[PDB]
Design a protein around this ligand. Sequence first.
Ligand SMILES: O=C(O)CCC(=O)C(=O)O
Ligand SMILES: O=C(O)CCC(=O)C(=O)O
Ligand code: NI
Ligand code: NI
Ligand code: NI
Ligand code: NI
Lengths: 379, 379
Amino acid sequence: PSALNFDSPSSLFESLISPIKTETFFKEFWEQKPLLIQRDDPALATYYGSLFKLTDLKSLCRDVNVCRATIQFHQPQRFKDELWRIQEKLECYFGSLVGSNVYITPAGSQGLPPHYDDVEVFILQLEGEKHWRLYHPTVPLAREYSVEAEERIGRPVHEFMLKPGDLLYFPRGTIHQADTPAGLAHSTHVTISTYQNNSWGDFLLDTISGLVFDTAKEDVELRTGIPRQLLLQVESTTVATRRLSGFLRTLADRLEGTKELLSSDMKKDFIMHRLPPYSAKLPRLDSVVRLQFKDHIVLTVLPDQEKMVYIYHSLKNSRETHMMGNEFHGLRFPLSHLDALKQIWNSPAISVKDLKLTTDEEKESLVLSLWTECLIQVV
Amino acid sequence: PSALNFDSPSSLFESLISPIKTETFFKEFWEQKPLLIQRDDPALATYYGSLFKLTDLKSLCRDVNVCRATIQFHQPQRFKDELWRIQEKLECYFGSLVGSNVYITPAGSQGLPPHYDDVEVFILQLEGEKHWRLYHPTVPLAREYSVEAEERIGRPVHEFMLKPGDLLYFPRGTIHQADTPAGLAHSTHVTISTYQNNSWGDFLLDTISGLVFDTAKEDVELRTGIPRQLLLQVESTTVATRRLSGFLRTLADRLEGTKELLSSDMKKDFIMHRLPPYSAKLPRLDSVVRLQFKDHIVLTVLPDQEKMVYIYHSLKNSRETHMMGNEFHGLRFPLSHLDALKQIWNSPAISVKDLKLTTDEEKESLVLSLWTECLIQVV
Ligand SMILES: O=C(O)CCC(=O)C(=O)O
Ligand SMILES: O=C(O)CCC(=O)C(=O)O
Ligand code: NI
Ligand code: NI
Ligand code: NI
Ligand code: NI
């Protein structure tokens, strides 16, 4: 029960934070307060120790980093399978990119100075022990990374010692600092982070375009031009703001009677950069098929590059470049197939004929396209 | 009085639409209805005929185009000085890009089919005569260009014959079509268009980022994360919309007590692409200086590339590439100089000492920087 169960994405997250119940996690901890899970499991401790060892550093020696005294290995999932398998499922579960960093510090040495990150972290102690001290956030759910002055963080709210097998979680903004106790053993943990720039402010901005565009199609006021030279001014004018206020309110109202939101980049960016699935009968129109690798698929309606249904998937993504950000697989379809696509999605199973399409050739053609992209499966 | 007065941008627009008064224009015509200005001025007619001749086509023969029967020369201001001088001032006046196209059609031949443009046009008859027919807009102040079916445009609302010296204006969305009367003479006019994508919907979207960012800095709710897998869904959820509605309303309210709006790209794009000014004593701290080429300057506060005052100008822009869009001059300053910058702007004159800056070296240094960029002038 303490071992990681990779059956499903949700089954994995359950085991990762075991014995804490997921229901409890999201209810009292997630994006609220830190959660220390000290364990007593020799097996899990040994498992954890396999995720990344000091020696793994030499075997693989931008990849690493040194902070005066602390060695940081970036995105180990590009080489370590177990982690790739872990973070992959985490991405499916959270629906957000999930990267990780490894921190290695020698005995008796301090680590990075007091600071707070801009992501949700999941710390796993792999080797040795680390002295942690968490402080109250100066910026709850902070959006950017920052270091703070000791004269500002106040006094620790929670202090502890992590050892192999333990797991530490805390929301973005949580000020922290750690050091390796004097002695012989060095410390080694990996920090699995997610939910970066995945707030409502990001969602609002990632959907406001489609809203304005759809609304302006019926409100001539939005289609009206701006004052002359407005862009040449050095200071905004009350009218302009007053005007924009009404427009925001109009948008608001229209939204209530809305059921569609368009992702300008969020969806695309996620699928485009996420990890590929851990990978270490031909359909007829009489067949019964269903989506596979759903947690790796995404769809939206965008211009041709008129408006067509686009299917983006990450089955062909590179794990060697995950999160390194040093650089579009899918399918294009006419709106007429949208509903059909939505049927396939929700339906746990479905017959090719039941597709709400015009003719059987396209009824088949479609499922045949999806099949070549490894998205469809026959029963 | 009918001749074009290039003293100032505003003096030019006045002469362009002469004898119509600008006050009348913006009050009853601009973005409202078409305005036909038939004239009787042999001088102006001859002037107009110089702006672009059939022969100018050969002298310069993506540049041209042929539509079955109609020849379209694109962006003539890249070679014709008078036009460059005209459109430049128009850009200063409108604060929006101002491009132009030339249409040449032989006698007795129809032109493009019925359609409506997505820009504010200013048609100038240069040679010959053209039979015009305007129809009611099917999409008032349309945002995109489109052709319409004769079975839809209804019956002409205004019909006329343009001849050298005349000027025709109509807002975007105004359906139209023209043909060259049978005979000997061909038609030649230039269409000066502006205000493309310069609506409130564009402004809202071009400023919403800075608003959310500034608001989220005090509203933790905006900083809160989105539901898991929200980006993996195929259909929005009432909650999400309801949520976004409140956020829009919050933004609205905050705006009322706001006095600052940030341009994400609008300003930058304008200066970056506009035309350069028509171009065919060293300052001391005791000097009295004032901005020159103001209508060609713009400022905003953006990340370093922390937040610094950026000055962008178009004095070094290429007229040969204007509006061809087949591809950043300015200065960087610390916020501490912003107010000083704003002083220089509003002030019709000002002494270097009066700059609200810390020390005299920077009081001078600043004005010296601006001076090398050709922005400052001494009295
Ligand atoms: O190990 C350390 O010194 C601290 C690492 C850290 O800041 C983190 O895991 O977020
Ligand atoms: O000259 C023509 O045939 C029509 C040109 C046109 O559509 C325009 O000037 O907007
Ligand atoms: Ni950290
Ligand atoms: Ni310690
Ligand atoms: Ni037209
Ligand atoms: Ni005719």
